[PDB]
Every structure is written in structure tokens, then in C-alpha cells.
Amino acid sequence: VANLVDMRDVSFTRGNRCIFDNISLTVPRGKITAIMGPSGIGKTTLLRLIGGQIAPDHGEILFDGENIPAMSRSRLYTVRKRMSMLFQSGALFTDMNVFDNVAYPLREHTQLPAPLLHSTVMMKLEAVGLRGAAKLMPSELSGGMARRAALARAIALEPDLIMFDQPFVGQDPITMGVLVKLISELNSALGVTCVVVSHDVPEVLSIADHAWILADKKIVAHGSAQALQANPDPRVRQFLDGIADGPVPFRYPAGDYHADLLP
Amino acid sequence: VANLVDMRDVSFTRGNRCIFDNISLTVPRGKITAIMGPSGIGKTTLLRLIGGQIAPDHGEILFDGENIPAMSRSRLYTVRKRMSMLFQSGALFTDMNVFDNVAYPLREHTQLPAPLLHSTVMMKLEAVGLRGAAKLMPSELSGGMARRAALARAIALEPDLIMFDQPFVGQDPITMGVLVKLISELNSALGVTCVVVSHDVPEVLSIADHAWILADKKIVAHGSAQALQANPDPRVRQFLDGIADGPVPFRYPAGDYHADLLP
Amino acid sequence: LNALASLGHKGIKTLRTFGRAGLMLFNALVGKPEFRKHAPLLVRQLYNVGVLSMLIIVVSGVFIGMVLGLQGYLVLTTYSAETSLGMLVALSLLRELGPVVAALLFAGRAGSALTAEIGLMRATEQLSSMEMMAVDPLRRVISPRFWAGVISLPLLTVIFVAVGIWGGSLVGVSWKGIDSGFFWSAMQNAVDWRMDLVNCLIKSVVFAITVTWISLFNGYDAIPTSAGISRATTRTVVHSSLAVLGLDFVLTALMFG
Amino acid sequence: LNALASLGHKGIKTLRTFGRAGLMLFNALVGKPEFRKHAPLLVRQLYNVGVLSMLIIVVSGVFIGMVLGLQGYLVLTTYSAETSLGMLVALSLLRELGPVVAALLFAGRAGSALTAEIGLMRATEQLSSMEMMAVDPLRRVISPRFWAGVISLPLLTVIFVAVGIWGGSLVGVSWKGIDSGFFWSAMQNAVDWRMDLVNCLIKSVVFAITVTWISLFNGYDAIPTSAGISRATTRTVVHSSLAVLGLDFVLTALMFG
Amino acid sequence: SLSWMQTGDTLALSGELDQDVLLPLWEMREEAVKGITCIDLSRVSRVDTGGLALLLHLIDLAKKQGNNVTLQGVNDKVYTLAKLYNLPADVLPR
Amino acid sequence: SLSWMQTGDTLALSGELDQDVLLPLWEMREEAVKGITCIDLSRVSRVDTGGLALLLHLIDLAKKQGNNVTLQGVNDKVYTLAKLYNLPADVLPR
Ligand SMILES: Nc1ncnc2c1ncn2[C@@H]1O[C@H](COP(=O)(O)OP(=O)(O)OP(=O)(O)O)[C@@H](O)[C@H]1O
Ligand SMILES: Nc1ncnc2c1ncn2[C@@H]1O[C@H](COP(=O)(O)OP(=O)(O)OP(=O)(O)O)[C@@H](O)[C@H]1O
């Protein structure tokens, strides 16, 4: 099918709040697609709807032709061999060192031999640069090193879809100088569909093929980088640069005010 | 005394590894001082030596004229009323909502009245913009909102020293457009000595008065934004921009090759 | 309103809790089998649940067999009836004090250690990263912990009994000088294989399914905060060891009445 | 080498563990006082430790008083000696089964809930952000949890006894028809205030200091990983309830021998 | 040391409006708001948030049972601490 | 479907070097390394890391009991996957 992830008309509700009014986005097969927006808008909630960890209210999420919430428990973990995910906080197995942590998702789904499961993941720890840290337990890594170890675990299997979730944060500009080249040389060399969610507007716009900017309830703009650079005038070019007013830049939907200050 | 934190000749050892050969830095009283360097170099370890949570091996850490490792247990928590600290991961009290979380360090050391402890922290949640989120427990904040709630708790008391630790990460460029102005308008209006540790070389260099770049064992360069820009030629201007070789850009001190690849 | 609706609010929330616990077990046990990836994992959890708990049952098995030999002797020796001491030690244990006291010591050690583990695993994001790797957490974490708990309890009962009977045979025969032949011969034709030995085996299996189910459910549906895990651990020891003492009265009215 | 040095390696590491636990308590109790900030915090931990554990002691107190009334009656009624049943129920409890079984049920519920809480508090970064706010964690977290544990155990013993004595007075006097006057009058002049009542109070305080110390130390010096907290919870129930059964033999040889 | 007394028709202040010493003036917020036309603020060194949250109350008690109050003698340190906390022109009259 | 057979003096490959189907060639790594001068690699679609880690072993068994091997017919997809993983000129002869 012509594009991998299709969202028809998705809605969501965290008890009382109304995020995702009537969003509808598509992800093509084999191209890096960015996702941006203000803080607390539901970008990580957008990635968790695709994986099936939470369910929408009003739409279908078509992963390669089949619906995600209309899928049973035994079929969901068969489809989930196709999509990996980097988490926001590292979130790696603390009772298991780095070499046994990168080698974990391809010890489950690949029947690779023992000196081939040792040569594959000794290359995955050279892409991010974290080789020689193959014996430290993940309580003596730093915290910017615990993302580069959880970035190798997102690309260890080479699945059909990778859903990154802020990979570039907490990195010096000689390490996110090569972590941006690793994602740009994975879909160029293996054909892996990536989904990059980040807050570095010069970094991921230089590599994505179809970006997306989110606003209050739904999509505000979306097109190739160049075609999404200043051509949407009123609400974009305030988010990409600027401090002053537009439609709701930040400041979570607060209540009155004075009543807050004065007793 | 003329400068707040002075390090004479500090050394450290994480069991076998040798970080901090013979570093010696000073922090002036009332000026924002940056700290930069590659990943996994020990910047968060530099902030934890000042607080006294770990002890050095070869030096004195002079906080306002008195030594930190030569300080007993009952005197250390008397001096620690002067220094707060933002943590890397948010790290806020999960059994206590945001309004009772910002109001926690000034319910211990200030004898403020009840409608003044409610008007002070309802302003602290307006500086970062997180007002109206004064009733959510810290398991339904996002994760970029859980730093703006832990940033208000670092400035709630207005102590003499604030040790930020990556405050700008995971924020859109209309929110770290005002979080950089909050730290620049705190030492300009209250005289608070800040210590900013970050990986955003255009952001914190625009506000700091005496930056510091760290290298393999010790300091590599220091100087105001301009004095520290273009000035130091060989090893600086490779870290600030560039991909190729200098002295040890990244790739943690790995062992031999081949033998890792070939069995 | 308030007395009428809020007891309807807070009773319906228990009907979801019974449904959340039933749906957890059906998805954990009834599954697509794997006999060479769960069998190395069963040996780990048979070690963690059972073997570390074997020291607390041996030492506390000898003690409660001794005090039924000490306080059983002193009240019986005035009537010169100390040759019927074995009918008191080996019938308190084989009927009631065996399956129950070895259940409360199991819900303490193994019951809290399973709830404090799967609770903290859920809070340190190791159950979200495991299920986002096409690895079922109810088949990897819950399933070899249920089968290693339904096995470790009926074997820990017969170690609690067989040192409790021997513990009463240390202060009876050896320390207080009751005869070596009249002691054991009065115990032998008072213990039947159907009423006293199989009906102790049936009691331990029912307590093993009960304790292990409540211990895994309170450590799966727990709030991952600070006091959320501390009051799911308290919720394990109280609820799963009231269902021991509640089911024991029902069973002892059926198998011995 | 290996048999000689590695037993010297692994025995010295225990000498640091005894020193780490002693230095923890001296810095927790011996401190600069505060009687209107720790006293609201003591009421919370007296509720969490004690009051939630009061249901498990009441229900399990009646049961172990009943089975010493059931199995105590059937072995005594052949000699027509059922009017000395109270000397068996109210002396098993006041001497040994009271201070010990109410200690093993305390180290289970309260012993694990304190170790699984301060362990997870240490892993979710709530002890690093508390000590970096000029707030002592050994005076805020450990100190009102030690005093609320040395208080809740000697009061939970006398609730375990007074329903165990009443539990044996339900199947003695009411259910099996022993006389209401000969039962209590044979119990009264066999229980002395110095040998049977104060020597149960002394036993419970020693078990309260022992259980609470091991429960807080294993939840403070624990590895904050996944199985680090699950094997500090197991380390609590085993070590602190072997020191119950180890100190009980020493004390029962001194106060009753 | 927060020292204060009005000049008869203008509430003058002195010292610093810290969080260490503030309760001498929070108790006496009743006799020092009525009949005042302007807060002098002339020789106060610095104002913290535990001294600026009082000023939004010390103005409010003087606005209702007295003359509408005005301000005097700032350092542009209680103004850059006012646009930082986004205080409107109601609570602080610039 | 990984299909392979040498041309008599040159180890030709076909298919894809995936991680799904690789064990037919990992077992027969003994009779197909000796006496070979060049790996043809002509009509293999794509190479993954579970097919490139084999190639650093299939060259090594052919370097020691045979002619020093050379390569042929790449897509510049096993070269951008070689400078990415920082493979030197020893393990892969460019
Ligand atoms: N239990 C919950 N867990 C997480 N988020 C919740 C929960 N309940 C409600 N929410 C809301 O859902 C939204 C989730 O948004 P999300 O976490 O994706 O923000 P984000 O895009 O990651 O922002 P940032 O990148 O700044 O962290 C938040 O605004 C939060 O307020
Ligand atoms: N128990 C431990 N906890 C944390 N770090 C440890 C420990 N033991 C050894 N280390 C080492 O100490 C160093 C600490 O450095 P630090 O965590 O400050 O890096 P960093 O400057 O924060 O890098 P980044 O910003 O990329 O996270 C790490 O390189 C780590 O390898």
C-alpha cells in the first residue's frame, strides 16, 4: 500500500481535556517525516496512538492497510514486529548491561548465530560511538549516553517503521552532528521509514521530506521543508522564530488570574 | 569574599576511570557562568562535587570561603540553604501536585503567611508559563512540562547559588525563547549567581559572563563570549562547529578493534 | 444522595477491579505456547520464589513444632498422659497450622517481593519498553511467576510439616524422655492418609492459587508513584492473607466436620 | 588463595554493612529536635504502619487462639481434663506464640512496606532532590518511621493476645460447653503479672527495635535497579525474622528457664 | 532590617523587602493602608518575590478603604521583575 | 530468497542478504571460501547488518585458506553502510 501510516479522523480525551480535534496525517513509505509543535501539545501521544498503547475515539489508524484499534491481542504483537520506538527518557533495562541490551530485540525475532549476534551489535555500538561502553551497567552511564544506547536499540532490528522521540536532545554539537547523519543515512541505504519528533527546527527540517506542525486542536501546516519555509505566513514563522502573540504560543489553558493572585 | 565557588585542584575517580585530572575553576559572585563540553565528560559530576553529594580526592572546594569536604553533617545542611539545584530529569515529588511542589522549599525555610505562600508561587508558575497546571499530579504532566515545573522549584527560594543542569532541553523555540530570558532577568534583577550547564552553544553563550569548555582531563579554554570565540583556535572551533578530528571529540575510550568484530 | 450514590460509586469500582484481575490472568496463562524460552525463565523464578524462602520455613517450622511440644507436655504430664503428645503435635500441623502458617509466611516473603518488583518495574519504564518490542509482558513477566508460585507452596508446606513433626519429636522423645516407641506408635494410628495427608495437600494448592493471583495483580495494577507501591504491598499481605483465613474456615468445615 | 582470600573478601563486606547500618541510625535519631514538624509526620506513619496492620492481627489472632482450643480440647477430654484448657491457650500466647507470631506478621506487612517504599523513593530520585533542598532525608524519612515502628508493635501484641485468649474462650466455654467459672478460675491462678505479663512486654519491645532497624536499612542501602529492590524486600523478611527467632530462644532461656 | 513609618500622608518604606524579615509589616497591614495616597519606596534596597507579593496586597487594602494609590522612586528592578512575572496594569500601576 | 553458487572460480550471490533467510549459507561457509578470488555480488538486492556481518566473516575464511579476495558490483549502499559503521580498510577492501 502506497503510504505506511494513515490517520483518518482521530480524536482523543484525557478525561476532560480535548486534544486532537480532527487530525488526519499520512506517512509515506520510506521517507523521513517530521512532527513538530509547541510543548504539551500531544506529540508523544501521537506516537503512542500508532503503536496501539492507547486507543482513539473517532478514527482508524491504518498501519499498512489494516486498522490498529480493530486488532486483537494476539494479532497486535504480530504486527508490532514491524515498528520499533525510541522512548523520551532512555528507558532501558537496568538489570542488563549495554551489549546485552542492544542485542535484546534481535535475540527474539532473528535466529542469528552466536558470532553473528556479536558482530552485528558491535557495529550498532559504533554507529552512535558507544563502543567500549559494552560492559557498563545502565546505572553508570551518564544520561546523554543513555540515549545513544537506547538509540542503538531502536535500530537494532532494522524494522519497517522507527518512531524516534526527541533523539537529538542532551547532545553536544559534534555528537548530534553525527546522530543527524545516522538517521539521514538509514533511510537512504536501507529504506527504513522513520518518524522524527523533535524541537530542533534547523536539524530535522534539513533531513525530513514531509514535515508537520501541530497547533491547538489540529494541524496548522505541512509540506516539504522548502515549501514549508515562510510560505505559510500567519501562524508558522511565529513558531519557527519569534516571542510575541499568535494563536496560543505557550502558557497551558490557565484559569482566571487575579482570583489566583489575590486570595 | 570576592568569588563564590573556588576549586583549588580537584581530582576524581569512578573506581578505575580518571576524570578531572587537575581542574581549577572559579565562579564570580552574581554573574552567569556557563559550563560546556563533550558528552560523558563529567559536567553533572562537576555540579555534584559542589553540593557535597560526592567527595573529591585532591582539592578544596571553597563555597564562599569555607571548604565543602571538611564540613560535618550538621553544618553541611546549614550551608545548603544557600544553593538550590535543577536536576537533569525533572525529579519532582510524585505524590504531590505542582502547586504543593513549587511551594515546598519555601514552606521549610521561610515563615511566610498562608496568603503570601499562595501569591508567591502563583507568580513562579507564571514565569515559566505553567499556571493553570497547579492541580495536576506529576504523572499527568508531559515531560517537557515536568522541567518547567522543576525549574520553578529551583528558583522558588531565590537562594544565593542556582546550579542549572540542562534547563533548555525538550522545549519548543517559543518557550526556550522565554526560559532564556528568565535566567537573564534573574541575575540582572535579584543578583542571583547562576551556573548554567548546557549543550546549546548559541543560547547560553549569549547570556553568560565567563564560559568554560571541558576536554579530556581538564579545562581547555575559558573567556567571555567574544574572548572565548574565534580566540582559542585548535581545539575550540572544532567543538563549537565541525565533525572531524581534534583531541577526542566523542567515542568513549574504547578497546581494540577487529577482536571486537571478529570472534 | 451522598450515602446512597457514593456507596454505589465505590462498589462499582470494585466490580472493575475483579474484572481487571480476571482479564489479566486469562491473557497470561491462555496463550500460544513456548517450551524452550519459558522453561529457562521458570528455573529463575522457582529459585527466587521458592529457594530463598526455604530458610524461613525450616527455621520457623521447628519453632512452632517445639512450642506445641513444650506447652503440650506441661499440661498433659499431671495426668501421666505424655505418651499422647504426638497426637497433638502431628494433628495441629497436618490439619490447620501447616497449610495456614506456611501460607502467611509465603504471602509475606514471596507475596510482597512479587508485588514490589512488578510495581517498580512498571514505574522505571521497563514494562512500556518491553511491550513496545513485540514482547508480551503478561507472557514474559506474569506467566513464569504464576506457575512458579503454584508449585513452590505445596512443596514448602511438606517441609514445614516434616520439621514441625520432628520439632515436636525433639522435645518429646529426646529432651523430656518420653519413650521412643510409645510416642511414634500413638501418632501412627491417628493419622489417616485420606483425612490428614491428602486433605493437607488440597488445602495448600487452593492457598497457592489464591496468594499468587493477588500478589501479581496488586503489582500490575498499581499506581507507579512513591506511596502507590507501598500501599499495593500492604494491599497484598492483607487481602491475600485474609483469603487464606477466610477460605480455611470454609474448607475445614467441609473436610473435617 | 581462593578459599582463603575470598572468604576474607566476603566477610569484610559484612563488616561494612554493620557499620553502614549503625551510622545510619546515629544520624537519624541523635539530632537537633523539632516537635511541631515531626509530630504531624508521626501521625501519618503511625497510621500507615499500625492501623492498616490492625485487621491482619485481629483476624489471625482469633484463629490461632481457636486451634489451640480445638486441638487442645480433643486431646484433653479423654482424661476429663477440659477445665484446664485455659492454662494451655493463655500460656502458649502470653509466653511464646504472642511475641513471635505477631512479630513475623509485622515483619511481613510493615517490614516489606517500609523497605519497598524507601527503596523506590531512592530510585525515583525523591531522595536526591530532598537532600539537595537542605532537608535531611534521615531526619524526615527514617526518623518518624523508626519511632512509629517501635510504638506500633508492643500495642499490636496485646491485641493479638487479648483476642487469642478470647478466641480460646469461644470454643472452650461457648462451643464445647466447659463451665464458665472453672475455665476462667483455672486461668487466673496460673498467670502471674511478673513472669507472664511483663515478660511478654519486654519481648515485644526487643522485637520492635530489631524488626524496624532491619526494615529501614535494607530500604536505604538498596541497589535502585529492578531486582535490587525485590531482593532487598526478600532480605528484609528473612533477616529480620531470623533475628526474631534467634533472639526468642535466648530470651526464653533467660526469662522462663 | 525592614523599617517603616508613614510621613503623615505617604507610606514611606526603608530597608529590604526580603523573605527573612517581613512579618512586622504583615501584621500591621490594617492601620497603614487607610488614608494613604502614595507609597514612597524611596530608600528600600531591593524587592524579592516575598516582598513583591506583599506589595500587591498592601496596595489592594489601600485601594478600597482609601485614596487610589500611586508609586514613587523605583530602581527599574521592580519593573523588570514585573514584566518577568507578567503583572498587568491592574495589580501594579506601572 | 537467498540463492547462491560459485561460477567455478568466483563466488556469485543472488537475492537479498537479510536476517530472515541467512542460515543456508552460514552452514556452508567451509566449501565456499577456499579457492575463490572475488565475490561477485552482482544481483543481490540489498544488504542488511545481518548480511554485512556475514560478509566480514565470509571474506575472512577466504583470506586465509585461499586467494586474497576482492569485491565487485556494489550499489554504493554497502559503502554508505560501511562508512556509517566506521569499517576500516582491513575488514572491507573498499
Ligand atoms: N497520564 C498522563 N500521562 C501523560 N500525559 C497526560 C496524562 N494525562 C493527561 N496528559 C496530557 O497529555 C498531554 C501529552 O502531551 P505530550 O506528553 O506528547 O507533550 P509533548 O509533545 O511530549 O511536550 P514536550 O515535548 O514539551 O514534553 C500533556 O499535555 C498532558 O497534560
Ligand atoms: N554510578 C555512576 N553514575 C553516573 N555516572 C557514572 C557512574 N559511574 C561512573 N560514571 C561515569 O561518570 C561520568 C559522569 O559524567 P556526566 O554524567 O556528568 O556526563 P554529562 O556531562 O552529563 O554528559 P551528558 O550531558 O551527555 O549526559 C560518565 O561518563 C559515567 O561514565
Side-chain angles (χ1 to χ4, degrees), chain B residues 51 53 73 77 80-81 85 87 89 91 93-95 104-105 108-109 153 163, chain D residues 27 32 37 124-126 128-138 140 220:
Chain B
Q53 305 189 217
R73 188 99 198 262
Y77 292 94
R80 264 198 207 162
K81 313 188 163 190
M85 171 161 186
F87 273 169
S89 43
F93 296 93
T94 43
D95 55 299
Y104 187 63
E108 307 296 315
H109 312 86
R153 213 185 49 187
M163 303 184 299
Chain D
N27 298 153
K32 190 213 249 190
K37 199 159 237 120
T124 322
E125 307 249 60
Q126 296 179 26
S128 299
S129 42
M130 189 182 285
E131 74 178 42
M132 211 52 214
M133 214 179 286
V135 168
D136 210 336
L138 300 183
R140 264 293 211 282
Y220 190 78

Coordinates of all heavy atoms in Angstrom, one line a residue, chain B residues 51 53 73 77 80-81 85 87 89 91 93-95 104-105 108-109 153 163, chain D residues 27 32 37 124-126 128-138 140 220:
Chain B
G51 N 27.9 20.5 45.6 CA 26.8 20.3 46.5 C 27.3 19.4 47.7 O 26.6 19.4 48.7
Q53 N 27.5 16.0 47.5 CA 27.0 14.7 47.4 C 28.0 13.7 47.2 O 27.8 12.5 47.5 CB 25.9 14.6 46.4 CG 24.8 15.7 46.5 CD 23.7 15.4 45.6 OE1 23.1 16.4 45.1 NE2 23.3 14.2 45.4
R73 N 28.2 16.9 59.2 CA 26.9 16.6 58.7 C 25.9 17.7 59.1 O 24.9 18.0 58.3 CB 26.4 15.3 59.1 CG 25.1 14.8 58.5 CD 25.3 13.8 57.4 NE 24.2 13.7 56.6 CZ 23.3 12.7 56.7 NH1 23.5 11.7 57.6 NH2 22.2 12.6 55.9
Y77 N 24.1 20.9 56.0 CA 22.7 21.2 55.7 C 22.3 22.6 56.2 O 21.2 23.1 56.0 CB 21.8 20.2 56.3 CG 21.9 18.9 55.6 CD1 22.7 17.9 56.1 CD2 21.2 18.6 54.4 CE1 22.8 16.7 55.4 CE2 21.3 17.4 53.8 CZ 22.1 16.5 54.3 OH 22.3 15.2 53.7
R80 N 23.8 24.4 53.0 CA 23.0 24.0 51.8 C 21.6 24.7 51.7 O 20.8 24.4 50.8 CB 22.7 22.5 51.8 CG 23.7 21.8 50.9 CD 23.2 20.4 50.6 NE 24.3 19.5 50.3 CZ 24.1 18.2 50.3 NH1 22.9 17.6 50.6 NH2 25.1 17.4 50.1
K81 N 21.3 25.7 52.6 CA 20.2 26.6 52.5 C 20.5 27.7 51.5 O 19.6 28.5 51.1 CB 19.8 27.2 53.8 CG 19.7 26.2 54.9 CD 19.1 26.8 56.2 CE 18.6 25.8 57.1 NZ 17.8 26.4 58.2
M85 N 19.3 23.5 43.2 CA 19.8 22.7 42.0 C 18.7 22.2 41.2 O 17.8 21.5 41.7 CB 20.7 21.6 42.5 CG 21.1 20.7 41.3 SD 22.6 19.7 41.7 CE 22.9 18.8 40.2
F87 N 17.7 19.4 38.6 CA 18.2 18.1 38.2 C 17.9 17.9 36.7 O 17.1 18.6 36.1 CB 17.5 17.0 39.0 CG 18.2 16.7 40.3 CD1 17.6 15.9 41.2 CD2 19.5 17.3 40.5 CE1 18.3 15.6 42.4 CE2 20.1 17.0 41.7 CZ 19.5 16.2 42.7
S89 N 16.6 15.3 35.1 CA 15.4 14.5 34.7 C 14.1 15.0 35.3 O 13.1 14.3 35.3 CB 15.6 13.1 35.1 OG 16.2 13.0 36.4
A91 N 12.8 15.2 38.2 CA 13.0 14.6 39.5 C 12.2 15.3 40.6 O 12.7 15.8 41.6 CB 14.4 14.6 39.9
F93 N 8.5 15.5 43.2 CA 7.8 14.6 44.2 C 6.5 14.1 43.6 O 5.6 14.9 43.3 CB 7.5 15.3 45.5 CG 8.8 15.7 46.2 CD1 9.3 17.0 46.0 CD2 9.4 14.9 47.1 CE1 10.5 17.4 46.7 CE2 10.5 15.2 47.7 CZ 11.1 16.5 47.5
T94 N 6.4 12.8 43.3 CA 5.3 12.2 42.5 C 4.0 12.1 43.3 O 3.0 11.8 42.7 CB 5.7 10.9 42.0 OG1 6.4 10.1 42.9 CG2 6.6 11.1 40.7
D95 N 4.1 12.3 44.6 CA 2.9 12.1 45.5 C 2.3 13.5 45.9 O 1.7 13.6 47.0 CB 3.2 11.2 46.7 CG 4.3 11.7 47.5 OD1 5.4 11.8 46.9 OD2 4.1 12.1 48.7
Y104 N 7.1 23.9 48.1 CA 7.8 23.1 49.1 C 9.1 23.6 49.7 O 9.3 23.5 50.9 CB 8.0 21.7 48.5 CG 8.6 20.7 49.5 CD1 7.8 20.3 50.6 CD2 9.8 20.1 49.3 CE1 8.4 19.4 51.5 CE2 10.3 19.2 50.1 CZ 9.6 18.8 51.2 OH 10.1 17.9 52.1
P105 N 10.0 24.2 48.9 CA 11.2 24.7 49.5 C 11.1 26.0 50.3 O 12.0 26.3 51.1 CB 12.2 24.9 48.3 CG 11.3 25.2 47.3 CD 10.2 24.3 47.4
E108 N 9.7 25.4 54.1 CA 10.7 24.9 55.0 C 11.6 26.0 55.6 O 11.9 25.9 56.8 CB 11.6 23.8 54.4 CG 10.8 22.7 53.7 CD 10.0 21.9 54.7 OE1 10.5 21.6 55.8 OE2 8.8 21.7 54.4
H109 N 12.0 27.0 54.8 CA 13.0 27.9 55.2 C 12.4 29.3 55.4 O 13.2 30.2 55.9 CB 14.2 27.9 54.3 CG 14.6 26.5 54.0 ND1 14.1 25.7 53.0 CD2 15.6 25.8 54.6 CE1 14.7 24.6 53.0 NE2 15.6 24.6 53.9
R153 N 10.9 25.2 40.9 CA 11.3 24.8 42.2 C 12.8 25.1 42.5 O 13.2 25.0 43.6 CB 11.0 23.3 42.4 CG 10.7 22.9 43.8 CD 10.6 21.4 43.8 NE 11.7 20.7 43.2 CZ 11.8 19.4 43.0 NH1 10.8 18.6 43.3 NH2 12.9 18.9 42.4
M163 N 22.2 26.1 40.5 CA 23.0 25.3 39.6 C 22.1 24.6 38.7 O 21.6 23.5 38.9 CB 23.8 24.3 40.5 CG 24.7 24.9 41.5 SD 25.7 23.8 42.4 CE 24.5 22.8 43.2
Chain D
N27 N 22.8 9.0 62.9 CA 22.5 10.2 62.3 C 21.0 10.5 62.1 O 20.6 11.6 61.8 CB 23.1 10.3 60.9 CG 24.6 10.2 61.0 OD1 25.3 9.7 60.1 ND2 25.2 10.7 62.1
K32 N 19.0 17.4 66.1 CA 18.6 18.7 66.6 C 17.1 18.7 66.5 O 16.5 18.7 65.4 CB 19.3 19.8 65.8 CG 19.2 21.2 66.3 CD 19.1 22.1 65.1 CE 20.4 22.9 65.0 NZ 20.3 24.0 64.0
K37 N 7.0 19.7 63.7 CA 7.1 19.4 62.2 C 7.3 17.9 62.1 O 7.0 17.3 61.0 CB 8.3 20.1 61.6 CG 8.3 20.2 60.1 CD 9.1 21.3 59.6 CE 8.3 22.3 58.7 NZ 8.4 23.7 59.3
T124 N 13.3 6.6 42.3 CA 12.6 7.7 41.5 C 13.1 9.1 41.9 O 12.3 10.0 41.8 CB 11.1 7.5 41.8 OG1 10.8 6.1 41.8 CG2 10.2 8.0 40.6
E125 N 14.3 9.2 42.4 CA 15.1 10.4 42.5 C 14.4 11.4 43.6 O 14.6 12.6 43.5 CB 15.2 11.1 41.2 CG 15.9 10.3 40.1 CD 17.3 10.7 39.7 OE1 18.2 10.7 40.6 OE2 17.4 11.1 38.5
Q126 N 13.6 10.8 44.5 CA 13.0 11.6 45.5 C 13.8 11.7 46.8 O 13.4 12.4 47.8 CB 11.6 11.1 45.8 CG 10.7 11.2 44.6 CD 9.3 10.7 45.0 OE1 8.9 10.6 46.1 NE2 8.6 10.2 43.9
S128 N 17.3 12.2 46.3 CA 18.4 13.1 45.8 C 17.9 14.6 45.8 O 18.6 15.5 46.0 CB 18.9 12.7 44.5 OG 19.5 11.4 44.6
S129 N 16.6 14.8 45.4 CA 16.1 16.1 45.3 C 15.6 16.6 46.7 O 15.4 17.8 46.9 CB 14.9 16.2 44.4 OG 14.1 15.0 44.5
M130 N 15.5 15.7 47.7 CA 15.1 16.1 49.0 C 16.4 16.6 49.8 O 16.3 17.5 50.5 CB 14.4 15.0 49.8 CG 13.8 15.4 51.1 SD 13.0 14.1 52.0 CE 11.5 14.0 51.0
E131 N 17.5 15.9 49.6 CA 18.7 16.3 50.2 C 19.4 17.4 49.6 O 20.3 18.0 50.2 CB 19.7 15.1 50.3 CG 20.4 14.7 49.0 CD 21.3 13.6 49.2 OE1 21.0 12.6 49.9 OE2 22.4 13.7 48.6
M132 N 19.0 17.8 48.4 CA 19.5 19.0 47.7 C 18.5 20.2 47.9 O 18.4 21.0 47.0 CB 19.7 18.7 46.2 CG 20.9 19.5 45.6 SD 22.4 19.3 46.6 CE 23.1 21.0 46.3
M133 N 17.9 20.2 49.0 CA 16.9 21.3 49.4 C 17.1 21.6 50.8 O 16.2 22.2 51.5 CB 15.5 20.8 49.1 CG 14.6 21.9 48.6 SD 13.0 21.3 48.3 CE 13.3 20.4 46.7
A134 N 18.3 21.3 51.4 CA 18.7 21.4 52.8 C 17.7 20.8 53.7 O 17.3 21.3 54.7 CB 18.9 22.9 53.1
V135 N 17.2 19.6 53.3 CA 16.3 18.8 54.1 C 16.9 17.4 54.3 O 17.2 16.7 53.3 CB 14.9 18.7 53.4 CG1 14.1 17.7 54.1 CG2 14.2 20.0 53.4
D136 N 17.2 17.1 55.5 CA 17.9 15.8 55.9 C 17.0 14.6 55.6 O 15.9 14.6 56.2 CB 18.3 15.8 57.3 CG 19.6 15.0 57.6 OD1 19.8 14.1 56.8 OD2 20.3 15.3 58.6
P137 N 17.3 13.7 54.7 CA 16.5 12.5 54.5 C 16.4 11.6 55.7 O 15.5 10.8 55.8 CB 17.0 11.9 53.2 CG 18.0 12.9 52.7 CD 18.5 13.7 53.8
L138 N 17.5 11.5 56.5 CA 17.5 10.6 57.6 C 16.7 11.2 58.8 O 16.5 10.5 59.8 CB 18.9 10.3 58.0 CG 19.8 9.6 57.0 CD1 21.1 9.3 57.5 CD2 19.1 8.4 56.4
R140 N 13.9 13.2 58.0 CA 12.5 13.4 57.5 C 11.8 12.0 57.2 O 10.6 11.9 57.5 CB 12.5 14.2 56.2 CG 12.2 15.6 56.5 CD 10.8 15.9 56.9 NE 10.3 17.1 56.5 CZ 10.5 18.3 57.0 NH1 11.4 18.4 58.1 NH2 10.0 19.4 56.6
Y220 N 17.2 1.5 52.6 CA 18.0 2.7 52.4 C 19.3 2.3 51.6 O 19.6 3.0 50.6 CB 18.4 3.3 53.7 CG 19.1 4.7 53.5 CD1 18.4 5.8 53.3 CD2 20.5 4.8 53.6 CE1 19.0 7.0 53.1 CE2 21.1 6.0 53.5 CZ 20.3 7.1 53.2 OH 20.9 8.3 53.0

